[PDB]
Amino acid sequence: SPEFLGEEDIPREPRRIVIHRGSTGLGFNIVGGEDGEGIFISFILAGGPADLSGELRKGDQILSVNGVDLRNASAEQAAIALKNAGQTVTIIAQYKPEEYSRFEANSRVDSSGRIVTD
Template sequence: MSAKKWSDLYQLFTMVLSIEHWAMAESLSLQRDITRVLELLEILQRCPEIQPSKLAALQRILQSDFCNMIREVYEHIYTTVDINGSAEVKASATAKATVAAFAASEGHAHPRVIELPKTDEGLGFNVMGGKEQNSPIYISRIIPGGVADRHGGLKRGDQLLSVNGVSVESEHHERAVELLKLAQGTVKLVVRYTPRILEEMEARFDKQKARRRQLS
């Protein structure tokens, strides 16, 4: 996606966020704001001096799965970001961070927010990789019948980006496992689907195991 399109995306966020006063940001609900924008667009389409095709295109964008994905990531960042300042400063910084997250994932699947309940049986998936292995942390297995399997959404091949707002992109394997074990209640994960990299990582590990067997 070009720099201009990311700029347009940021402007769209600014427009949606400005529908409600910045002072309301403490009870953030972008879905409410987007719904209000869609209502206003329907009214504007009845104005003869406005081109309805452009408004219809904007409606399709706001109702798309991609826009919903952006909203989920934005709300997750907003509730976890640690920024001192007014609600306006926090909202503006969150919008920029959201655009940066999607821009950084260009050429890959976009980030998704997955929420899973933490139960006595755990979360129902395994992870592999980590800083000590010079690789990202990945979901390597979804346990059949487990929590993640029953709730859906999480995939083998998802890269784990954060756990309850704590980034694990440059963390050791043990740290990611610790965060998952310590999590309670509803666990919020930000992930990105990049199965090819997981396959390459597993192939590398298999070669290392084969070499160790030959040397032993």
């Protein structure tokens, strides 16, 4: 009997993740930022710093960057904070796929809590 992770819930509590900046950037994209809706990871680049951490995913909201609260920041504000965060970037993230799925066209959350796009 194979034990798929797919049948396992993704943790919903906040987590602390440390990223080490490459010679290319932190390796993820963000969406959101309008009217305090929040900043969400929409894409993680294969092989990039966020990927290498192995602790971030599409659908994570970025709550803070190096202790600076980003929950109500604009995307531009978030981009600036992330750019200016130095070589070692400490992120507090929280998996919020339902909120995230609102932003991505034809996306939804399945019974396992995974984000699916049709």
